[PDB]
Design a protein around this ligand. Structure first.
Ligand SMILES: Nc1ncnc2c1ncn2[C@@H]1O[C@H](COP(=O)(O)OP(=O)(O)OP(=O)(O)O)[C@@H](O)[C@H]1O
Length: 423
């Protein structure tokens, strides 16, 4: 069968990599993808957000199954475009994608269905929002309503930073309609963690747990980014935390969707903050997280293509998790998360291909002749398996010693928050 993966980053390389292990796929396509994915998939020169054009391609090319990686295409209704042409695609339709597409929608939904989350208030008026934050004081979190390419959610340590943020969002409208409405919520403290499940109507199946590191620099400093590294599983989500997540979050989302009459099929990644009060939703992501997908998929033993195909049509499935830990360190471009420098030659990729228990997922890489060059903010995902987390971390960092590109930056503390939970 023909399978199409939509997206150009590390999450998509992980997806394609897993799909390519299945005896079912005969032709694998990626739109657009990157240098790393092109070693195992045919390049489709269509941007992931050109949803109508992608649907037309899949139809004409006869794609049997499509898996969507990033949020933009989903929020834009790529699934609806595919359904319109009678195509099978894994991901939520435009209405269901609102759980990620609109913070206001998500927060209102969670309040209505009793889902644990940060207390909040919604605003469309700068003066009103300003007066509000001055009254509540800091720390506080200010978020744009719609997608803002990783710049919509800002933690403000001071009231001044909050008003400055509101100014850019509401007065300047830096993100257009996306920033014309904002959500201001309480700053939550605790340990961050990621819980991802696959949902199809009333049924859901959990995927490996994980913990990401959002800040650019070691000891959680510097600006927020799309994610600088993640590992699986994370002890932050023990047996009982997982029980609370499934019952107070996942199952309540399912109940809410049912009451709203909204059909949901696809991945649901809940960005969490595990507080002393219990797990709370920072935000919903209607797709796999990046880089969370990398270590997660590294630990899914079974044929993931078969699993997705069966789950897609309502068949029961059972995820078999690798007993080994999986850790991923992101190598980013100088400038990231602000304008990244690009066009730098990446050396050492061949060395890593021969390293055992090492896996590299490309993110933002392209070709320049026979050379592989940087083309985006996040460039490489240097991953490694390990019987223990310590082993996984050390192997990943050992691998980093052999890869290189000008201006490369990466955190050295990926996974450090987990050790206080282990022995
Ligand atoms: N209520 C909160 N309390 C504490 N930290 C928060 C809160 N909300 C968000 N954060 C921090 O911001 C991060 C989210 O960054 P993220 O970019 O994923 O926001 P987003 O919802 O995806 O919208 P955008 O991508 O445009 O910024 C969280 O992982 C967390 O570290």
């Amino acid at each position: 069968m023909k399978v199409l993966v939509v997206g150009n980053g590390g999450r998509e390389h992980a997806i394609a990599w897993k799909v390519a292990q299945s005896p079912l796929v005969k032709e694998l396509y990626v739109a657009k993808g990157n240098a790393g994915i092109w070693e195992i998939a045919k390049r489709v020169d269509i941007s992931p957000t050109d949803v109508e054009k992608l649907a037309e391609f899949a139809k004409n090319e006869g794609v049997d199954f499509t898996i969507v990686g990033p949020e933009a295409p989903l929020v834009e209704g790529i699934v609806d475009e595919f359904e319109k042409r009678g195509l099978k695609i894994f991901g939520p339709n435009k209405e269901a994608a609102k759980l990620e597409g609109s913070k206001a929608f998500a927060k209102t939904f969670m309040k209505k269905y009793g889902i644990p989350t940060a207390r909040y208030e919604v605003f469309t008026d700068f003066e009103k929002a300003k007066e509000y934050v001055e009254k509540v004081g800091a720390p506080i979190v200010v978020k744009a309503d719609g997608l803002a390419a990783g710049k919509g959610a800002v933690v403000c340590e001071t009231v001044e930073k909050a008003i400055e943020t509101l100014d850019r969002f509401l007065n300047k409208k830096i993100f257009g309609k996306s920033s014309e409405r904002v959500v201001i919520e309480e700053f939550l403290e605790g340990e961050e963690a990621s819980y991802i499940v696959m949902i199809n109507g009333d049924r859901y199946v959990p995927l490996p747990t994980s913990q990401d590191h959002k800040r650019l620099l070691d000891e959680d400093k510097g600006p927020n980014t799309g994610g600088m590294g993640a590992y699986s599983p994370t002890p932050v989500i023990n047996e009982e935390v997982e029980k609370r997540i499934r019952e107070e979050i996942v199952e309540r989302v399912i109940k809410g969707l049912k009451e709203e009459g909204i059909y949901y099929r696809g991945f649901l990644y809940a960005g969490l903050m595990i507080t002393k009060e219990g797990p709370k939703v920072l935000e919903f992501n209607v797709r796999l997280g990046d880089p969370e997908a990398q270590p997660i998929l590294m630990r899914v033993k079974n044929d993931f293509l078969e699993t997705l195909l069966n789950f897609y049509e309502g068949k029961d499935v059972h995820i078999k998790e690798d007993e080994r830990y999986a850790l991923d360190v992101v190598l980013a471009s100088r400038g990231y998360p602000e304008k990244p420098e690009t066009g730098k030659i990446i050396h050492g990729l061949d060395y890593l291909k021969s390293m055992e228990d090492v896996v590299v997922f490309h993110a933002g890489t392209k070709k320049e002749g026979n050379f592989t060059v940087t083309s985006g903010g996040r460039v490489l995902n240097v991953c490694a398996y390990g019987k223990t987390l310590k082993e996984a971390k050390e192997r990943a960092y050992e691998a980093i010693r052999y890869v290189c590109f000008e201006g490369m930056h990466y955190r050295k503390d990926i996974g450090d928050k987990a050790f206080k939970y282990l022995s």
